[PDB]
Amino acid sequence: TDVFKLIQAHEEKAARLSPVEEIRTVLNGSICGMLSTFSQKYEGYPSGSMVDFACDADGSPILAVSSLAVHTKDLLANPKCSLLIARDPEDRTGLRITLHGDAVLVSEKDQAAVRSAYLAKHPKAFWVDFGDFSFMRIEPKVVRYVSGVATAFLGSGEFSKEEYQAAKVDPIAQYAKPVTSHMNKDHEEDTKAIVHNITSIPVESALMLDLDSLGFNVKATLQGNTFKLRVPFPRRAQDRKDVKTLIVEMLQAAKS
Amino acid sequence: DVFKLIQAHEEKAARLSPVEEIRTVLNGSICGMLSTFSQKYEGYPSGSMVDFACDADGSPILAVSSLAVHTKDLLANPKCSLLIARDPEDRTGLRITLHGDAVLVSEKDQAAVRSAYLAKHPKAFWVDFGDFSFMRIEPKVVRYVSGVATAFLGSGEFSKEEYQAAKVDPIAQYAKPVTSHMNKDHEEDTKAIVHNITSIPVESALMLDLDSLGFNVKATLQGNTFKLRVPFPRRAQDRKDVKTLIVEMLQAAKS
Numbered sequence: 001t002d003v004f005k006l007i008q009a010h011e012e013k014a015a016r017l018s019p020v021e022e023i024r025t026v027l028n029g030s031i032c033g034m035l036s037t038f039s040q041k042y043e044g045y046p047s048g049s050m051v052d053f054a055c056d057a058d059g060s061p062i063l064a065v066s067s068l069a070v071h072t073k074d075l076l077a078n079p080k081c082s083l084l085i086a087r088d089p090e091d092r093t094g095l096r097i098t099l100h101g102d103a104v105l106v107s108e109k110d111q112a113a114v115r116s117a118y119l120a121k122h123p124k125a126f127w128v129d130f131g132d133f134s135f136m137r138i139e140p141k142v143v144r145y146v147s148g149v150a151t152a153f154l155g156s157g158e159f160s161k162e163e164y165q166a167a168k169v170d171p172i173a174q175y176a177k178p179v180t181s182h183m184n185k186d187h188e189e190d191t192k193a194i195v196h197n198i199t200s201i202p203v204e205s206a207l208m209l210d211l212d213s214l215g216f217n218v219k220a221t222l223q224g225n226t227f228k229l230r231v232p233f234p235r236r237a238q239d240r241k242d243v244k245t246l247i248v249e250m251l252q253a254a255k256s
Numbered sequence: 257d258v259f260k261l262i263q264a265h266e267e268k269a270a271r272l273s274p275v276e277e278i279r280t281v282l283n284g285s286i287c288g289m290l291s292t293f294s295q296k297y298e299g300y301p302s303g304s305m306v307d308f309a310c311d312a313d314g315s316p317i318l319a320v321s322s323l324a325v326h327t328k329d330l331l332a333n334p335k336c337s338l339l340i341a342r343d344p345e346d347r348t349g350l351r352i353t354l355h356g357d358a359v360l361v362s363e364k365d366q367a368a369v370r371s372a373y374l375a376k377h378p379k380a381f382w383v384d385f386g387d388f389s390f391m392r393i394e395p396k397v398v399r400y401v402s403g404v405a406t407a408f409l410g411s412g413e414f415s416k417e418e419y420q421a422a423k424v425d426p427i428a429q430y431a432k433p434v435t436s437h438m439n440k441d442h443e444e445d446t447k448a449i450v451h452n453i454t455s456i457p458v459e460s461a462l463m464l465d466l467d468s469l470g471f472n473v474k475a476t477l478q479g480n481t482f483k484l485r486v487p488f489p490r491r492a493q494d495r496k497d498v499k500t501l502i503v504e505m506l507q508a509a510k511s
């Protein structure tokens with residue numbers, strides 16, 4: 001009722017990555033998504049499949065495709081495709097990114113950089129060396145996003161190839177998994193106090209979602225309402241240990 | 257060798273026919289990935305997440321907002337596909353792709369279609385907003401693939417007529433409550449049944465889904481995870497009969 005307007009005022013103000021930096025960063029941390037192609041076998045229809053991928057240094061998704069797969073034959077007959085990424089694949093209100101582009105076979109000089117980028121995200125994918133597997137790269141044309149579907153907070157927009165490639169991946173997001181886990185399972189009481197302090201909302205619960213150099217996001221519950229809150233750090237975190245120090249300081253501040 | 261012992265059991269175990277399995281999984285699914293032709297970016301396909309509900313013929317019903325990108329895609333070109341993953345995070349699971357043509361629902365059909373959708377999305381009050389409409393994807397062809405990166409690889413396709421003629425398994429609707437109550441309160445009962453019927457000593461056995469002929473489990477031995485089909489000694493007739501059959505299979509397991 002009145003808190004849903006208090007949330008809006010906090011969300012509009014809290015420090016966060018710029019839109020293009022957020023999309024570049026979420027894409028770089030994702031490893032799987034839904035590929036849309038033109039169906040080669042069912043002429044006139046599009047087609048979807050689940051694929052693993054890894055962004056190369058430029059942010060271009062790298063795919064390891066079997067010559068036996070339906071989507072591979074699709075891509076060889078028509079390279080124009082799209083890749084749909086969901087930050088939380090079952091969060092109906094999450095960020096959703098669609099990257100449209102053109103699948104191209106990776107050149108021989110690029111095989112080594114591409115193999116390492118892919119294995120960095122899929123360390124047990126020994127099959128990438130099999131003869132029937134090749135690496136393909138989706139060269140972006142446009143990257144579109146939508147977030148907060150079925151909520152008051154809806155954001156959307158698109159970035160050109162040049163805008164997306166020029167953005168830097170946030171160097172702190174890579175530490176997201178260990179920090180959020182250790183905090184959600186052992187210090188969930190600290191998270192709510194910090195959230196309580198900085199948004200003035202008494203939160204029944206608060207689970208850390210993701211993390212970047214400017215702060216972290218949480219899923220919070222009050223009454224029969226669940227919603228997301230941005231928790232900015234008092235200053236930009238410079239490395240992993242710095243993330244830990246900043247949370248301690250923010251906890252200390254709430255005990256005052 | 258286990259990976260040959262399990263395979264022999266999987267090849268024999270009673271299970272739904274392929275078309276009945278796909279018809280049943282699709283009818284139990286409520287969300288998926290919609291591929292359309294992009295209206296704004298000519299020549300490219302486009303993807304988005306949608307909620308849906310199958311109507312009685314198995315046709316996915318969508319409630320789409322006129323504000324949404326995929327709606328504008330569908331209004332310019334109704335050809336689309338809907339990708340469903342039975343276990344959305346299992347990379348080796350069954351994956352179903354239904355290709356077809358999205359069509360506006362008639363005024364005579366609004367009420368039946370609205371109820372089929374709300375049966376799967378009971379709190380979706382927004383379907384009554386003015387900018388929302390029901391669309392139905394009329395299937396052309398339904399394709400499936402299962403077991404990517406496993407020994408068990410299955411694939412095939414079904415025409416519209418073949419898919420529509422198949423019946424949804426009437427026992428699968430009870431899968432969620434039955435599997436839950438068994439997984440957290442009687443996982444030891446499940447392990448005895450699986451061991452008895454496959455002779456595999458399993459560290460664990462987790463029920464995944466259920467149908468009138470039996471249920472599937474995720475099982476572990478050593479550092480290996482795999483799926484095993486556990487058929488009933490006979491077809492189950494209703495929910496209580498599912499309970500009745502599981503007791504008997506456990507009783508048999510003591511011996």
Ligand code: HEM
Binds near residue numbers: 146152323326
């Ligand atoms: C309680 C409030 C709201 C609810 C329950 C709600 C519900 C939904 C749902 C279910 C969809 C999915 C439509 C589809 O898949 O076709 C949607 C999409 C959308 N909504 Fe809302 N909505 C709410 C508030 C808002 C507000 C406040 C705005 C704008 C100020 C908005 C703008 C949009 C847009 C642009 C989309 C389309 C996104 C796309 O292209 O896929 N909504 N909403």
Ligand code: HEM
Binds near residue numbers: 066
């Ligand atoms: C006789 C043995 C096998 C057969 C007949 C087979 C069959 C297939 C088929 C038909 C596909 C196409 C997927 C699609 O159409 O979307 C595929 C893809 C794939 N297979 Fe196999 N498979 C076998 C063994 C294996 C094994 C043992 C592994 C891993 C240990 C494996 C890993 C994969 C992967 C990762 C993909 C996905 C590649 C892509 O998405 O392009 N395969 N396989």
